[PDB]
Paper text:
We recently discovered Arabidopsis SOSEKI proteins, which exhibit polar localization throughout development. Polar localization of SOSEKI proteins involves two conserved domains: a central domain required for membrane association that dictates localization to polar edges, and an N-terminal domain required for focused localization at these edges (Yoshida et al., 2019). Furthermore, we use structural and biochemical analysis to establish that this ancient protein family contains a bona fide DIX domain—constituting the closest structural relatives of the Dishevelled DIX domain—and that these domains, like Dishevelled DIX, undergo concentration-dependent head-to-tail polymerization. Concentration-dependent polymerization via a bona fide DIX domain allows these to recruit ANGUSTIFOLIA to polar sites, similar to the polymerization-dependent recruitment of signaling effectors by Dishevelled.
Note that no structure of a wild-type (WT) Dishevelled DIX has been determined as yet, although multiple structures of domains bearing polymerization-blocking point mutations have been solved. We thus used the structure of the human Dishevelled-2 (DVL2) DIX domain (Madrzak et al., 2015), to design a set of point mutations in the AtSOK4 domain that are predicted to attenuate its polymerization (see below). Crystallizing several of these mutations, we succeeded in obtaining diffracting crystals for D85A (equivalent to D78A in AtSOK1), which severely attenuates polymerization. We thus solved the structure of this domain at 1.7 Å resolution, following labeling with selenomethionine to determine phasing. Like DVL2 DIX, the AtSOK4 domain adopts a ubiquitin-like fold, with four β-strands and one α-helix. Strikingly, its α-backbone almost perfectly superimposes on that of DVL2 DIX, with a root-mean-square deviation (RMSD) of 1.74 Å. This was rather unexpected, given the limited primary sequence conservation between the two domains (19/93 residues). Like other DIX domains, AtSOK4 DIX forms a helical filament in the crystal, via head-to-tail interactions of individual monomers. The interface between individual monomers exhibits considerable hydrophobicity, and close hydrophobic interactions (e.g., W83-F81, W83-H34, W83-H36, Y84-F37) are likely to be crucial for the DIX-DIX interaction, although hydrogen bonds (e.g., D85-H36) are also likely to contribute (recall that D85 was mutated for structure determination). Nearly all these residues are fully conserved, or even invariant, among land plant DIX domains, suggesting that they are critical in mediating polymerization. By determining the crystal structure of AtSOK4 DIX, we established that this domain is the closest known relative of the DVL2 DIX domain.
Author numbering: 18 to 109
The structure:
């Protein structure tokens, strides 16, 4: 199965529209960050996703919070099986 993922890249402060990709699932009850990163590696090259620290949008108080993810972490959806991530440019 494949799931829809929207991601926002943030450099100075997200000077750009989000991207939409379809991500192949490794397990049928859940998406892991590694699944997203594998798909980006295929589309954008191995050198892209490692430039960013990844978060997923999650409900918090009266809005949302960007919840920091590791490669091995499970990603929870927001709203209706909707997956929204943010890659924040690593500054080193």
């Amino acid at each position: 199965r494949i799931v829809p993922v929207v991601y926002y890249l943030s450099r100075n402060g997200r000077l750009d529209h989000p991207h939409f990709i379809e991500v192949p699932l490794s397990s049928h009850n859940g998406l892991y960050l590694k699944d997203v990163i594998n798909r980006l590696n295929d589309l954008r090259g191995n050198g892209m996703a490692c430039l960013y620290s990844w978060s997923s949008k999650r409900t918090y108080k009266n809005g949302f919070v960007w919840y920091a993810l590791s490669d091995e972490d499970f990603i929870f959806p927001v709203h209706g099986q909707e997956y929204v991530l943010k890659g924040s440019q690593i500054l080193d």
